[PDB]
Design a binder for this molecule. Structure first.
Ligand SMILES: O=c1cc(N2CCOCC2)cc(N2CCC[C@@H]2Cc2ccccc2)[nH]1
Length: 559
């Protein structure tokens, strides 16, 4: 073993081609998932046929682990092969930016591959790419220059690495700028980072101050970007102050609610019912005129979230749920992954009427959730109308539609049930009950409150497919043509998502050092818990018959 890999071959068999039997062994090893550890035998094998593997872009990520970088004999040839290799897809490049690869060239190369991606894709990975800064050169991030984090943006002055790249893209795209601001603010406000990795806490302040510096340095349109972020930041700082002023001022919930409205209605002091048309950080397409004082209510629940109604640019209400005294990041992640999964299925022309509602932490302590206007907890739906079918008949009846319900509504309910069954199965969402399953009168089922994920549950053995009796009776029972449809969607959705397993797993790779509670328990064992739910051991034909039997053994058990 201890004889180095370039000491055992190279480049006198750059002329190698593997035989039929070996080509199978490689293709298995190459398209392994991206935290599946490789054995010394397999790392040796990948090195042996390294000149063959330069025509399989998939394989590049595997090869670079087998390089020993301390040996400059190895490292100089390895990086020569990195230029002769087929360039990898952006989907894959996220792997190179994780904790596992430390070589400057490898990481700059990854950024060059990212720079091929357009901002719509880049946004879907931005949360993870802010985590990826932790594995960057902290000295180089500092040396770009030319402390409360919430004051940086509001206090002006009278080969790209990852940090330089993200800032460059943010100054050219205001959507990225919005989310890059708030993601980095949370990493600064991360207190566990302040304690155990104070050097990392400094890096994110340096990232924020680097960003603000470019915004001020940039042209006329870019400088306005800075003042819009400053507007958001004080608005949130005022909103958080208004929350503290209620959370403290004692009395019951009804006295606190009267209090909440008093402070909102007072715009001289608190300055929240008539903002100057600023962009909502949650979704910056929505500019907000102010919070409506008279509708604002506090939820009868543990951390007292406030239900707030923003009056918008175009005369509408955009309701949100603002939590003070609660970590949102575990939700931020899940909704962010469900957003992708929704988009990946639509890539394949499968719209399953999913509800990936917006979530933005504006600190570790607090943040925003988009309220879906018209949603009701399935519990509440069962409680007042009796069944999921009675609900739909009352609110969307039809002479010819199935069970006296609009066919379009019944279709929506099926598809959403199917998608969320598969998606809550993969992500390992536990602690499901009828208060965290919501229903809409459009037909849409969806899930909220992701306090338990990646296997975790109050129960020791939860069921793997999160599907109850009431849900099945909403279709028409096990013999309806709806339930036939509901299976077909599940196995198809499961199949399509399997074909982006590599992407999803590379994303979860980046989230291990993010202090998300259900990931922090078993960070190394986190990514396998997702990987294993895809059942990559099976073929597509086998995966279908698996997903089928998953759904059947679950539904059989219910009756
Ligand atoms: O984590 C979430 C997300 C919620 N949303 C966001 C998506 O639209 C529906 C409401 C609501 C909640 N909560 C927490 C306090 C109570 C509320 C749950 C709720 C949902 C629907 C009607 C009444 C109450 N939590």
């Amino acid at each position: 073993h201890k004889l180095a890999r370039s000491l055992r071959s190279g480049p006198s068999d750059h002329d190698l081609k593997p035989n039929a039997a070996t080509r199978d062994q490689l293709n298995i090893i190459v398209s392994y998932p991206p935290t599946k550890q490789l054995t010394y035998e397999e790392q040796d094998l990948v090195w042996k046929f390294r000149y063959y593997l330069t025509n399989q872009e998939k394989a590049l990520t595997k090869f670079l682990k087998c390089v020993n970088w301390d040996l400059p004999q190895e490292a100089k040839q390895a990086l020569e092969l990195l230029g002769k290799w087929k360039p990898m897809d952006v989907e894959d490049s996220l792997e190179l930016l994780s904790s596992h690869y430390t070589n400057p060239t490898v990481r700059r190369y990854a950024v060059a591959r990212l720079r091929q991606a357009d901002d719509e894709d880049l946004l879907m990975y931005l949360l993870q790419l802010v985590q990826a800064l932790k594995y960057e050169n902290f000295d180089d991030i500092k040396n770009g220059l030319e402390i409360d984090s919430s004051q940086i943006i509001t206090s002006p002055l009278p080969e790209q690495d990852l940090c330089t790249f993200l800032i460059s893209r943010a100054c050219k795209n205001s959507t990225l700028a919005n989310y890059l601001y708030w993601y980095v603010i949370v990493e600064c406000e991360d207190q566990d980072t302040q304690q155990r990795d104070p050097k990392t806490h400094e890096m994110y302040l340096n990232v924020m101050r680097r960003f603000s510096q470019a915004l001020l340095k940039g042209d006329k349109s870019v400088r306005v970007m800075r003042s819009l972020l400053a507007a958001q930041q004080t608005f949130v700082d005022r909103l958080v102050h208004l929350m503290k002023a209620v959370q403290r001022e004692s009395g019951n919930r009804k006295k606190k609610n009267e209090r909440l409205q008093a402070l909102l209605g007072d715009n001289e002091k608190m300055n929240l019912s008539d903002v100057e048309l600023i962009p909502l950080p949650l979704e910056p397409q929505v500019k907000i005129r102010g919070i409506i004082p008279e509708t604002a209510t506090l939820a009868k629940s543990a951390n007292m979230p406030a239900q707030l109604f923003f009056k918008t640019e175009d005369g509408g209400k955009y309701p949100v749920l603002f939590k003070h005294g609660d970590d949102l990041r575990q939700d931020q992640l899940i909704l962010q992954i469900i957003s992708l999964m929704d988009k990946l299925l639509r890539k394949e022309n499968l719209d399953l009427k999913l509800t990936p509602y917006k979530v933005l932490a504006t600190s570790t302590k607090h943040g925003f959730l988009q309220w879906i206007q018209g949603s009701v907890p399935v519990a509440e739906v069962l409680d007042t109308e009796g069944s999921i079918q009675n609900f739909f008949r009352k609110y969307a009846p039809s002479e010819n539609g199935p069970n006296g319900i609009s066919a379009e509504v019944m279709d929506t309910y099926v598809k959403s049930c199917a998608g969320y069954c598969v998606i809550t199965y993969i992500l390992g969402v536990g602690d499901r009950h009828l208060d965290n399953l919501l229903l809409t009168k459009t037909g849409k089922l969806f899930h909220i409150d992701f306090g338990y994920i990646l296997g975790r549950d109050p129960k020791p053995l939860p069921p793997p497919m999160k599907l109850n009796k009431e849900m099945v009776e909403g279709m028409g029972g096990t013999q309806s043509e709806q339930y036939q449809e509901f299976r077909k969607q599940c196995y198809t959705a499961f199949l399509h998502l399997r074909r982006y397993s590599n992407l999803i797993l590379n994303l979860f790779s980046l989230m291990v050092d993010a202090n998300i509670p259900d990931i922090a328990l078993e960070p190394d064992k986190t990514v396998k818990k997702v990987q294993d739910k895809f059942r990559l051991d099976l073929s597509d034909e086998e995966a279908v018959h698996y997903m089928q039997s998953l759904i059947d053994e679950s539904v059989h058990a219910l009756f």
